[PDB]
A paper describes a structure:
To determine whether this homogeneity was observed in a Proteobacteria PilB, we performed cryoEM analysis of PilB from G. metallireducens (PilBGm) in the absence of nucleotide. Projection of the PilB CCOCCO crystal structure revealed that the PilBGm top-view 2D class averages were consistent with the CCOCCO conformation. It should be noted that the N-terminal domain of PilBGm, known as the N1D, MshEN, or GSPII domain, was not observed in the 3D map although its presence was confirmed by trypsin digest followed by mass spectrometry (98% coverage from the His tag to the C terminus). It may be that in the absence of its binding partners, this domain is disordered relative to the core motor domains of PilBGm. Thus, cryoEM analysis reveals that PilB preferentially adopts the CCOCCO conformation in multiple species. This is in contrast to PilTGm and PilTPa that both adopt OOCOOC and OCOCOC conformations in similar conditions. We also showed by cryoEM analysis, in accordance with the recently determined PilBTt structure, that PilBGm uniquely adopts the CCOCCO conformation in a noncrystalline state. Consistent with the distinction between CCOCCO and OOCOOC conformations promoting PilB-like and PilT-like functions, respectively, we note that while PilB adopted the CCOCCO conformation in solution here and elsewhere, the equivalent C2 symmetric conformation adopted by PilTGm and PilTPa is the OOCOOC conformation.
Residue numbers in the entry:
A (entry chain B), B (entry chain A), C (entry chain F): 182 to 568
Write the structure that this text describes.
Amino acid sequence: PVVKLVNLILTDAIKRKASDIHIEPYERSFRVRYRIDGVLYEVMKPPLKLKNAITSRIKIMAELDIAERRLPQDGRIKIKLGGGQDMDYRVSVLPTLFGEKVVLRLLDKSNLQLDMTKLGYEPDALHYFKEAIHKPFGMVLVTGPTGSGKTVSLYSALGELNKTTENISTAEDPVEFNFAGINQVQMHEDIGLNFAAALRSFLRQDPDIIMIGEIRDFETAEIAIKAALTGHLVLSTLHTNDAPATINRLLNMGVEPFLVASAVNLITAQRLARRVCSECKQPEEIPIQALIDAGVSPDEAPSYVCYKGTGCVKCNNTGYKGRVGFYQVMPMLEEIRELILNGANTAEIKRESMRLGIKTMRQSGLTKLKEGVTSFEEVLRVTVADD
Amino acid sequence: PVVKLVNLILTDAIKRKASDIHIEPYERSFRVRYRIDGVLYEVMKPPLKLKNAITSRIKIMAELDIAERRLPQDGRIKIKLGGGQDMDYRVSVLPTLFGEKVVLRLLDKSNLQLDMTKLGYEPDALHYFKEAIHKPFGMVLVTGPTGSGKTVSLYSALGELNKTTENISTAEDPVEFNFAGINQVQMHEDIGLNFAAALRSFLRQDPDIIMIGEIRDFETAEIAIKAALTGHLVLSTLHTNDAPATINRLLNMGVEPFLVASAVNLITAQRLARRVCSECKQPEEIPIQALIDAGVSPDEAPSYVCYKGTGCVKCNNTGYKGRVGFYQVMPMLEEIRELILNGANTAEIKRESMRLGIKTMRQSGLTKLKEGVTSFEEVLRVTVADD
Amino acid sequence: PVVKLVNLILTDAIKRKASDIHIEPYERSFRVRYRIDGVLYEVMKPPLKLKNAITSRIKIMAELDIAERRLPQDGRIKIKLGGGQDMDYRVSVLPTLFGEKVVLRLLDKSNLQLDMTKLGYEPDALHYFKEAIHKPFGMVLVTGPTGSGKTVSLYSALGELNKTTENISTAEDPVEFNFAGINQVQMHEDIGLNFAAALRSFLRQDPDIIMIGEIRDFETAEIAIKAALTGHLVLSTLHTNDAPATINRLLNMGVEPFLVASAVNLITAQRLARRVCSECKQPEEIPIQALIDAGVSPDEAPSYVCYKGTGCVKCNNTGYKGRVGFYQVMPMLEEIRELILNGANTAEIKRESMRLGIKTMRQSGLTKLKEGVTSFEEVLRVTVADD
């Protein structure tokens, strides 16, 4: 009955066509609630009676951590039919006093679209990104938090590059989207297939462009560096606040700055914020000083028309519907490289990139605010200030 | 024999409407003190020789190990007093050289009052609080020291707001009563779940109603006020003297003024003062001007029949029996928002709330004096004059 | 002869009013030294055959391990030779290269006055100190070395606060005197009871007034600040050169100015300086300019009447006998608070404090010089000039 019970619990939430799934255990109750169009409904009460006797066994059956019931966890679930027309869930686990509560929010690979022109890049930034992904070598780091649009931007680059003249092979943990003509390896760390082993196999597979799901340790980073310096364009990912903090993250990991300065051609940082609801969007009164204090460049300010959804069902009573990406696309220009040779810190890199005209994710969010697709509060929710 | 005596001690604290029990060893003495209506009284001087065995006994009731008498310990005790009559205790024991000091904190909503009109909210304050907690988004802040009835007031607000349609998440320090259906996280710094990380998980847990235990740094504050503006109901606390001093805490840490002004609907501050004992209360010829100087309106002064209990056993020969809440309930009125955007200080905001009719906590207490419910000295003891 | 000699070593210290006894064996000598008013004098050169015998004898007096003579040992002795408290001694055995040196620390509360008005406070300073110990919350720091009457000042405050209405918790390493009603904790770090654990534990003990033995880091400093800010009266110590540099020290430590301004009510610094002996006291024609150089404002200069002891047996032929306390009391004035909030350093706080009437220990000593109880040179010896 335990095998059936675990199968029932996992299957029912998926089965009932819920827009958000809330699984909440308590001291005396254990409930499932569906958020449908911004509103929660209690949808199921599993029994308290079988919780403790068959505890560890089910936790092993659902491939969950049987020993940990105390800390938050965050992930992604991409479910494809083979390819990219994949329905996916953003999964968040939270430790309540009587067990872990999980919240699942639905999204799609294509509703958040893979056209690099549709990703929100400024013309210089879009130029640098397209120019960067079409180079024969170097490192491109797409940075941002979880749920920030990273997989779409990298895949947008892969689509831009997927041509019959080049051999594309990717190593992902896991593979988010399938591409015919691209040799995609999903990491199977258990059998020894991790990012390092897959990169080395790619390196034994006569590769031209190598994609690694993530730079996890300095050794894998170093192998990626090797692949980049031997003549391959290597693209990978880190979870950081912005592009320069990714620099400081690798420097803090122990990589010499000059390797950072030499191997990386472009670092982008990004985000997903909610787009104002087109049904209830209204212009919103926001003081000019708060927008200036939040990071907007002086020339875009007077033009801003900030919209806010009053909150309807298509925005989950949030006033926002869909997502918008806010980007800071900083190229590793040769002067910046010289600065590394002159020992500049990451903060100096940030100062110089702003000096070079690179708008931050905050300024790009304020740009989205300017076009009236997001609100200033969304800009503040998803990005940090440039001040 | 001694165990039974201990049971009597714990029953008597409840019977005497004590809020705290203190089992106190000294170098050469041992005494038991109850905090009754917020004030401690020496109630027992047990022999020092038996105290540690008694302490050892408490650990069995807490399912704690009697063997360890050398480390600080903290826990809970559930005692089954018959039927639904069960009693939770937050217990902290500390082993000094000459014995263990034990502190007991009663955990029973039965002892608590839950009707918000019965909490001490003035009709203006109750009205403004209800108006604040029933808005679809924004922040409501309840200030006062620990044990000032903040937990009772918030428990009443969440109960007002406790719907299946909302994802309610609370971060608490500590939990004083358990509600099924509310996602309650208790802080545990040793494993990494703090206010900032928990707040970000709440923003990722599809929240509707958010309660944050305490504000530690600027990061968590900015996240919470922006979560309020995003379309979440956010509750939190500060130890301030009034709502404006809480404001100024927020201003000095760096939250942009429009965020505070626009995401905060309302701020309450609240104290507890003892009620004049109904048995021994006698009119106290408190000069009416002293009442006015303390914050009584001029018209109500001569009407005041100020009472003080001369003292009887019902009030522990103190003249006071029970407590009452003094509330200053200041909604984040737009004029208050204009002041936030203009950088106003604590006194100006408090002055405007009073100008707008927000009774301060001192004035609320003197009104309680007018009703003969509390004495002038208790109002004076827990509130400062409005001056 | 060795037992009688040892008794002479312990008793002549009583007749000599010594603070410490040092019994030191050497290769070519053997001596007994008394500490009188902070200065050591040789009082006996007992026979070197008894070098180890006298010091080994004290172990026997201390109920210490005679079999071990190679390792440092520490114990306690209770001797009944008088005073106000028993002649208790803390014994420390050190195996030097020429025998065991034993040091005995004389313990007697009556060696210091516990009345606050007899601790040497000036009336305005005593008033501000009492006002400070009676506010419901905040932090007050008393700086000075141990034995400068700091613990007695604290104990005097505790006696003023030792009511059955307050929960008093102290963390001391160790507890010098015990007070009924005051919950005192001796630190025992071998079992996990350090200063940090005891503060956080007091905070779990429902405290009202909290005493801490020592501030050891920023982390503990933060817990302390928030305890003084969360409705507790917090008293603790550090040894710093003055109040303004203690300010700059904490600012350098990392505490936020607003928490500093909100939690600190008052900072005192205190030393015990030697009092000129009245018998050999003679007026000393100290030039007025030396006093102005020492720090008195020039308009007060001509009025100073400097005194000095010519030396007699009561003063060890030093001209001084006993101690008076030199206090410098900087209340956390609003002017001083505003200095905090603008990141002020030691110098401008010092300038403001002299502008605002904050007396230095040097100004208080010159006042005692004017009063003729201490001399200018002891002041110049143990204090540095202001002006």
